[PDB]
């Protein structure tokens, strides 16, 4: 909390100037430490002000008003800071009451492809900067991958569902601006095996622990052991997990081997002692007979005959001494064998029942990345870990679409308008689109710049759904091919009554095989109405799209019957099944770091395109084609807030390019 808390909530170090700040304020950062701390405070305090009340515009005047000495003494620095923060959407972003009604006349013209959250975010910003903005959406609605099913009182998100913590999340600001009913998610998730029997807390804990440990092991393989290339191909996370599991099985057998190898060494040492003991009992049996016969010679006897008796008496007790010492050793080894045999090492590493419950955990991971672990990059799949938000995850209880819709207010949005071609040249751009209903009804849009927020799945299409003229440069298309675009589906089950644990938010289901681990493996209870939400992930996600809704809802009911009771599970009143891979405006769910890709590709995606000159030997043109979207933000991919931030990012870059950066003096 304080000025430092605002810097945190804005994903910035409170006591250090960022790279983006170094660019805009090179005079300050290269100057004396004293000035830097003034800058940092000014920056932080302004952020605090905006955050404290994000439902009203924060003007430069209102900012200077609430500053102390010696911070309010240099009004140009205060202005440079405020403007910078406004330009890059750190303050005055989203839906807020504007103090100074929008500028009379617009400057520059921007066409924005897609009205997903990334598009909408940028659109608002550009309009706020006084640019002419029009969004072209192929769908009959805004929000794109923020889909929300509504019917009567039933409300369920088919796309984005979870807010991944508020600590530094720009969506925290949005939620204060929009009527979002944010309910927390309770972390407890009881699992239920194929039969319907709950997993015992003994197993549950040991498998989960084993899962996390296997993950850490792959991370160790990657960074410490440098296990990243296999047959010239980049190692996947799937590969690495198998390799780790195999080494854990190898060790189990290694342990057993040297344990039994201990037994045979002692058992064979005992064998040699028994041979010695048998050979001694044989010689004792014989020597006793000899002494016996020596005593039968009744006295009186000469000295040699007397000596014989005495001699054999000594000889016999000497051999009786040895056998007694050897029976002592026999006692020691005989229990030492009962020692080693009493505590055997692990029988197996994991049983068939275990491996199944572990597969559910892999399904969780396959859901989180929206892809088979065989596709994920070992080295990079988790490259955005550092930038996770703090606080418990939440859900939008009134449905997520409320956000896009609220952002869409007061914006020029052409629905049912499918972009077919993007043409960009030194003098400007034209975008060719059609009407989705009558596909021969053609449209032409002339603009200074195009912001492309097309999903990566769309950009990936072969043959192209959108043609670029001139074609996108090799470096861009290679990035598009390299990058991964996943798939994840949802099944919405609406009932007349709650038959599940109302205090449980989510419960798993363990599949029969590895092949089907993703299939209906997770269920969500989040909403006011009796709605259960079932996930289809992993390899199963893609195959379940070629299967009819009735069969899917069938398998859903089947599972729920096994867990709650055959007569406790009624017929669903309304059902919806998402198909994100088949959806032509998505062509998948969200991006992942594919094997062979890295986080750097995400940067390549965000890099704008500058056309060639019209006349040869003419000055280097302005950049014309800009890219925003979830697949363009390295530190926050595959998320709403990520898309949101990328939109803000590009708006800033576009405005800088076409309205000029006054704050860099």
């Amino acid at each position: 909390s304080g000025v430092e808390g605002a810097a945190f909530q804005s994903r910035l170090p409170h006591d250090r100037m960022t790279s983006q700040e170094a660019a805009c304020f090179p005079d300050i950062i290269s100057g004396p430490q004293q000035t830097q701390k003034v800058f940092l405070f000014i920056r932080n305090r302004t952020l605090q002000l905006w955050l404290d009340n994000p439902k009203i515009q924060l003007t430069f005047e209102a900012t200077l008003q609430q500053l102390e000495a010696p911070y309010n003494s240099d009004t140009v620095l205060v202005h440079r800071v405020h403007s910078y923060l406004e330009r890059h959407g750190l303050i005055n972003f989203g839906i807020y009451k504007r103090i100074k009604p929008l500028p009379t006349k617009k400057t520059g013209k921007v066409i924005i492809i897609g009205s997903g959250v990334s598009g909408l975010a940028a659109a608002r910003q550009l309009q706020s900067f006084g640019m002419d903005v029009t969004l072209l959406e192929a769908r009959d609605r805004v929000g794109g991958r923020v889909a929300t099913f509504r019917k009567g009182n039933y409300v369920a998100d088919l796309g984005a569902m979870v807010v991944t913590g508020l600590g530094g999340n720009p969506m925290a600001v949005v939620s204060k601006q929009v009527n979002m009913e944010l309910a927390k998610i309770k972390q407890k998730c009881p699992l239920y095996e194929a039969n319907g029997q709950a997993v015992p807390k003994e197993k549950d804990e040991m498998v989960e622990q084993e899962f996390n440990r296997l993950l850490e092991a792959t991370s160790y393989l990657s960074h410490q052991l440098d296990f990243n290339v296999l047959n010239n191909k980049p190692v996947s996370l799937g590969q690495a997990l198998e390799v780790v599991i195999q080494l854990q099985e190898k060790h189990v057998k290694d342990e057993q081997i040297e344990h039994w190898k201990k037994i045979v060494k002692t058992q064979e040492e005992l064998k040699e002692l028994l041979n010695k003991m048998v050979n001694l009992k044989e010689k004792i049996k014989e020597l006793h007979q000899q002494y016996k016969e020596a005593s039968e010679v009744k006295p009186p006897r000469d000295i040699t005959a007397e000596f014989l008796v005495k001699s054999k008496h000594r000889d016999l007790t000497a051999l009786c001494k040895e056998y007694d010492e050897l029976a002592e050793t026999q006692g020691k080894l005989e229990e030492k064998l009962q020692e080693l045999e009493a505590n055997p090492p692990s029988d197996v590493y994991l049983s068939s029942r275990d491996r199944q419950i572990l597969d559910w955990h892999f399904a969780n991971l396959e859901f989180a990345n929206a892809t088979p672990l065989s596709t994920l990059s070992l080295k990079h799949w988790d490259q955005d870990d550092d930038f996770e938000f703090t606080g418990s995850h939440l859900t939008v209880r009134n449905g997520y679409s409320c956000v896009p819709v609220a952002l869409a207010e007061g914006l020029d949005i052409k629905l049912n308008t499918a972009v077919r071609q993007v043409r960009y040249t030194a003098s400007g751009c034209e975008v060719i689109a059609v009407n989705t209903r009558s596909t021969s009804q053609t449209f032409i849009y002339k603009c200074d710049a195009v912001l492309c927020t097309l999903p990566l799945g769309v950009l990936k299409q072969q043959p192209p759904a959108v043609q670029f003229v001139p074609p996108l440069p090799e470096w861009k298309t290679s990035a598009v091919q390299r990058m991964g675009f996943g798939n994840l589906n949802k099944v919405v089950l609406c009932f007349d009554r709650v038959f599940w644990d109302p205090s449980v938010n989510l419960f798993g289901h363990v599949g029969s095989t590895t092949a089907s681990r993703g299939e209906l493996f997770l269920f969500w209870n989040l909403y006011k109405a009796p709605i259960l939400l079932a996930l289809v992930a992993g390899e199963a996600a893609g195959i379940m799209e070629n299967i009819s809704d009735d069969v899917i809802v069938g398998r859903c009911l089947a599972i729920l019957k096994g867990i709650f009771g055959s007569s406790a599970v009624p017929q669903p009143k309304e059902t919806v099944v998402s198909r994100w891979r088949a959806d032509p405006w998505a062509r998948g769910s969200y991006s992942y770091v594919a094997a062979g890709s890295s986080g750097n590709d995400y940067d390549l995606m965000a890099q704008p395109i500058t056309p060639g000159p019209s006349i040869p030997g003419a000055p280097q043109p302005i950049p014309r084609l800009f890219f925003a979207g979830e697949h363009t933000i390295r530190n926050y991919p595959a998320t709403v807030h990520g898309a949101l931030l990328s939109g803000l990012r590009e708006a800033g870059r576009i405005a800088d390019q076409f309205l000029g950066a006054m704050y860099t003096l």
């Binding site: 972390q187 969780n364 990345n369 988790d382 595959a638």
Partner: peptide
């Protein structure tokens, strides 16, 4: 990515 994992 990782952030979507349940049962953390």
């Amino acid at each position: 990515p990782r952030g979507f994992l349940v049962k953390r």
